[PDB]
């Protein structure tokens, strides 16, 4: 089969910019009867199906924005927006359409440039209400902080603990731009009622130090 | 050729290319139209010529069911033919309305 | 205008099997090609495999392993999809497409989507629990309260602030998976003098198993 590789899946924009997208296939997606390359462009939004932009390597889709080009041949493509704008940031694809099975890049996504944000940190002890109930979460929330890219660490007891954390990010917040993340600890309420300190220790490039929370059992 | 599109009769309202026409790996063409009648079901007339005053047809017409089966107006539907080497046109509809596009092919 | 509208989200048990529709508008059906597309999160888009109305004639990408099976009705200008023995694996939105073989225009007209989940679990209410801060108080000027709705099936829940007046400052996360069952949590952001002087109370609906419950945010005590 035909792979396409799209790279990087991510890039940051600021609204003006000339953004370059890059689509590799494995082998040639040119049919010399035609002379034409074989490779199409697609945009997908949040919650919609993908759009056609782009087909043939180069030719725009009737309605698709003048600041849409299609370029490339063989196995090297690119699409170029000229200037983008606010409605362009989505994920674009691009496809093999030169023989079956078709076949689709992982996508480039689209986001928005803004200053960097440290991240406010709150954590918060399982309620009682779960504690009477049988389980213990603890929850970690991270909010408002910008570039995305954040780890998060959790310490039990002046320890580390790593199993049983799940992490859910927020989209880019269509306002302000920054992103939000909770990290959830998951215990039973045997061991936790066994250990005292629990920490959430927050990694992000604002930071020279982890940016920590954390509580004891003992204190109220 | 199929009954299908002769029972239909042929379309008589006008039609409009959608997008320029484009050549397959083969060399035949592929050609999209919107027809604006309402008289659907109708079987859209499609061939290659030479001779805009005799409209002979050249080369062949390959789609199965060259027909419109939509009532409503503004249907699309997918033409693909086999065009003579060098110098042809697309001709698309019957009568006064009828368009055409230039094609050429090469390996006379 | 070209409209290709597909059927409504279906929810699956394993093992079983599924069939997806797509009723096309504005085009000659037996003209042009149904492609299907899977698109489950963590992949990218993924082709099933295509029919020709007009003809019957199907194509199928090997890596379904014979389990997908694409049928039409040329009357009703509708394209099946059936996907038998599912697997949670096969949990994702899946997509039809107008295309015309032969030519390079390449997949011009999408259906909207039907998402498929294929899971074992049962309807089962979600548990709501306030996270009050850390006891003792933050002793700022800001404080950031939660809610946690754990285990529950199947999506969606609505979580609101106040009945929805509390809008401003709020960060509701997207649902994990976590032992076959959903949780999502959500925070708040407010002044010291709003609260715990003012009332504020997370309010989640679970529709599906007639769920509506009102958590207040209470201080803790020792
Ligand atoms: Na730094
Ligand atoms: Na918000």
Known sequence: DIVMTQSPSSLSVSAGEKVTLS???????????????????????????????????????????????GSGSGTDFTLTISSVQAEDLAVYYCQNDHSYPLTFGAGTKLELKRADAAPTVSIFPPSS?????????????????????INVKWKIDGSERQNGVLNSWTDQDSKDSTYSMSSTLTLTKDEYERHNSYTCEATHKTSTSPIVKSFNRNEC | MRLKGVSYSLCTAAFTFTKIPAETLHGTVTVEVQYAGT?????????????????????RLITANPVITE?????????????????????????????????????? | QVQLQESGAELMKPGASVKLSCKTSGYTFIGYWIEWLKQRPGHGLEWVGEIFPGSGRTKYNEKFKGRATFTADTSSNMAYMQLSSLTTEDSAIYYCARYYYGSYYALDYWGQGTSVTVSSAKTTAPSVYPLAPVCGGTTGSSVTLGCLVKGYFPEPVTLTWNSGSLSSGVHTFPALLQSGLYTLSSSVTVTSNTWPSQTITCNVAHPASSTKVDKKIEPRVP
């Open chain 1, 23 to 69: 689509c590799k296939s494995s082998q040639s997606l040119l049919h010399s009867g035609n002379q034409k390359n074989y490779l199409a462009w697609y945009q997908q939004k949040p919650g919609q199906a993908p759009k056609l932009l782009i087909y043939g390597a180069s030719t725009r889709e009737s309605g698709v924005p003048d600041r849409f080009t």
């Open chain 2, 71 to 108: 009532s409503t107006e503004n249907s699309k539907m997918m033409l693909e033919l086999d065009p003579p080497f060098g110098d042809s046109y697309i001709v698309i509809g019957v009568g006064e309305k009828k368009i055409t596009h230039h094609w050429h092919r090469s390996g006379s």
């Open chain 1, 129 to 149: 209400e779960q504690l009477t109930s049988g389980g213990a979460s603890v929850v970690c929330f991270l909010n408002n902080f910008y570039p995305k890219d």
């Open chain 2, 39 to 59: 008289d659907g079901p109708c079987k859209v007339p499609a061939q290659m010529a030479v001779d805009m005053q005799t409209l002979t047809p050249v080369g």
